[PDB]
Design a protein around this ligand. Sequence first.
Ligand code: HEM
Ligand code: HEM
Ligand SMILES: C[C@H](O)[C@H](O)[C@H]1CNc2nc(N)[nH]c(=O)c2N1
Ligand SMILES: C[C@H](O)[C@H](O)[C@H]1CNc2nc(N)[nH]c(=O)c2N1
Ligand SMILES: NC(=[NH2+])NCCC[C@H](N)C(=O)O
Ligand SMILES: NC(=[NH2+])NCCC[C@H](N)C(=O)O
Ligand SMILES: [Zn+2]
Lengths: 407, 411
Amino acid sequence: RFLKVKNWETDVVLTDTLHLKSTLETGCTEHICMGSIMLPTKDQLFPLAKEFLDQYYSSIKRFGSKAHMDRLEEVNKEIESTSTYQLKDTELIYGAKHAWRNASRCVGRIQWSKLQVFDARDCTTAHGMFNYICNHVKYATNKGNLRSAITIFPQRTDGKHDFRVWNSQLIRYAGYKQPDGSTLGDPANVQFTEICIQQGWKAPRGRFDVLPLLLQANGNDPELFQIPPELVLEVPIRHPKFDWFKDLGLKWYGLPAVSNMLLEIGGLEFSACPFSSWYMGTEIGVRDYCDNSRYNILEEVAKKMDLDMRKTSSLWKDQALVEINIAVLYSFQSDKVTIVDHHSATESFIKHMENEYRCRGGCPADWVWIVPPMSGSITPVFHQEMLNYRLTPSFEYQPDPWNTHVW
Amino acid sequence: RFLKVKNWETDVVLTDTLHLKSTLETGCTEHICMGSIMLPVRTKDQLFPLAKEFLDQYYSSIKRFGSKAHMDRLEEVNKEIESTSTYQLKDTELIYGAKHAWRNASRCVGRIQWSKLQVFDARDCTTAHGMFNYICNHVKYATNKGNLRSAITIFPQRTDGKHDFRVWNSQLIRYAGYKQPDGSTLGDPANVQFTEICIQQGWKAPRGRFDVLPLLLQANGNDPELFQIPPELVLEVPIRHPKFDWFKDLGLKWYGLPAVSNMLLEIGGLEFSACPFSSWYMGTEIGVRDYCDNSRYNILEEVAKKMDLDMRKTSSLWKDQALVEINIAVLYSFQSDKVTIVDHHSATESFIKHMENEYRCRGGCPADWVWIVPPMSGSITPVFHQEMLNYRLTPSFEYQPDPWNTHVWKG
Ligand code: HEM
Ligand code: HEM
Ligand SMILES: C[C@H](O)[C@H](O)[C@H]1CNc2nc(N)[nH]c(=O)c2N1
Ligand SMILES: C[C@H](O)[C@H](O)[C@H]1CNc2nc(N)[nH]c(=O)c2N1
Ligand SMILES: NC(=[NH2+])NCCC[C@H](N)C(=O)O
Ligand SMILES: NC(=[NH2+])NCCC[C@H](N)C(=O)O
Ligand SMILES: [Zn+2]
């Protein structure tokens, strides 16, 4: 069964055979589409393993080879014997790269092949985790010349000895709920901040406090560690034409490092797998700065611009938004910290997507996430149809550890 | 089976029971979501269920479910379908049906207005000329000197599929598109093909960047005929900017009345192949899509130039900066001529209110996130952060193929 996707700006059509290899469910049915919903055993394990191994071996052009069968045989026995198994270094790398390749919500995926993979499966303690993580941050930041990396901690076993990173990103600002009801710093992290504090963190209480790492190894209680400040690259936010802008007091960190996700490879579950790359401007300028439930800076930025804020139809929110995003890309570029604007980013993903249909017969994409949170229809992805299906290896969500942890 | 939708900006949660009454298919499956795919002659036995269902809804809506009136009508329609292999809707039903097809239009952000809709019954129409007159009346009623009113005109339903009434224009009022030999396009590229059909059919084309197209009307399965809409009936807004005096020099204007004409209205199984409906524009439809889409009027570069923006590097956000001004200039021009119009903030805010009310009183409200979210400043409108379930309810507005692709020319 073939499927076609049209680009309504170029009339380009692509045929998707890849969705055929789909496994997981979408949350959608014949009678309902949940495309905008944010979150919709030995015998179990071997099929999963076999499938992965087949992919891998096909990818290296040894499908059916003796090597292939042997490995198949080996893994087989190992699962029967140990009720789990271990991936060869090559497989772990292939698996990680490909989970990224399959991340339908990622516009960055043209880069999927150039990924630095750190094997931290020999890790056993939170302190071990802290050290590994520090190495990742440093390698990835690279003095502002950002590099994509992932660090993979030991896989789950009985589910009672999970490695987990309790932060949602390696580096994020704290959130303090004041008594008057307002919030200081980043409201997104208010709850995590309360857990840190509650666990011993001496909170400075500022609008941009780098949070402590809170690391759980082997199922043990989480432990706090401060990331060497020297390791935390930051960009002060100023506007190329508004000298009053810097006075707003805004900065952001240069390294987005999602840490709360779950990497699945050949049936194996890696519950702690921080990955990092570089920001698209909008993530910060639009979502982090202007979301009503984040830093929410539109009013203030507007005021300083003296815009007509009486009537929404002045598009004062829109005007401010553009400046704010101009100031973010500007600040970063001026400090030579890697960053990409939403136009370049989306243009590349079209190129990527095309190439993926050519060489792979498809490329799963979540339109809702792929399209930037501003200027949607002026980027090429708006006009681009996308089929969304779920391929493994994958990155999955998982519950916040505090909701599930057995203290 | 209940379903919940969260608003990630307010944490409001809503429970959807309404999707249960869903009938049509989504194009989606357990293994694939086509949520971003633009487009994913009946029978006696087919028709009555469709009719019965509709009638049940209607009667429930007036609080006569199971009433003698209800059963009789049920009985009547029944016999009529058996006898005539079709049937006719009471005036009350046609109105209920139309209003509710709008109410179920999952791609419509304007639906808070769904109840206040002027319905024109043009089922007695028989000729293209008849159609032209009806349409002129609609345009005039709806425009209302710039104080826009929502209206729909419903022409005779399909019978054997050989005597369809069709409006060949996609909107009652739209600008022409001429493909020049150098490869460029004059006017609106979206209508180039329709323009060629008009010309080919006798239209004397002015060849300008804003020529109101002739109506091309088909009655009873007959060949289409041309009619010019009285210019005095076609309200237009010259586009200028409240601070850029150079803007008016761009030479831009738009018409004040969006009137989708190429859609198919289905009610109680009946198919109304010609049903122009009209309301008022949301700014972005014009400022963002019609003006800035690359394949429409594509004015970003020029607007940028005049602003002398840094167009060397995309990261100057020159496209973004121009876009905002252009949209400011559209809402401005219209408001200054007192032609109804709504900005994307007000529009999306209202739809949240509407959506909430719909969950309260109706147990749901089908919505297509991809279409509901404005083509600019997405995440600063409330609908971005709003989860939406999309399912298909009837009565509905459906797409249908372009008439020229299917028409059996009589000559
Ligand atoms: C290299 C440049 C990259 C860029 C420009 C980029 C860009 C983005 C953006 C803008 C989002 C939306 C995130 C949000 O709105 O919160 C996203 C999501 C995502 N990206 Fe990428 N990314 C890059 C690299 C990577 C890498 C290295 C990985 C993993 C190896 C990855 C996997 C993902 C995943 C799993 C999501 C969805 C996460 C979630 O649901 O919160 N990306 N990316
Ligand atoms: C009165 C104020 C209204 C507003 C502000 C409004 C707004 C909109 C907008 C912005 C769209 C997106 C259209 C596009 O992107 O091309 C849309 C789509 C749609 N609306 Fe409305 N509308 C209104 C009234 C109506 C009426 C009167 C009807 C029918 C009776 C209707 C039914 C629809 C339908 C069927 C679509 C889908 C069109 C398509 O698929 O191309 N709306 N509406
Ligand atoms: C309701 C909707 O699913 C939710 O707001 C989504 C919308 N689209 C998005 N797209 C991206 N890239 N990132 C996000 O956090 C969201 N949030
Ligand atoms: C491919 C994609 O679905 C297509 O560009 C859609 C996306 N969202 C839209 N949303 C609205 N309201 N109107 C449109 O024409 C579109 N175009
Ligand atoms: N480019 C990335 N890898 N982004 C990861 C998620 C970052 C997150 N959206 C933020 O703005 O904080
Ligand atoms: N508000 C409406 N009824 N819009 C109908 C579609 C108009 C279309 N978006 C246009 O720009 O021409
Ligand atoms: Zn779907």
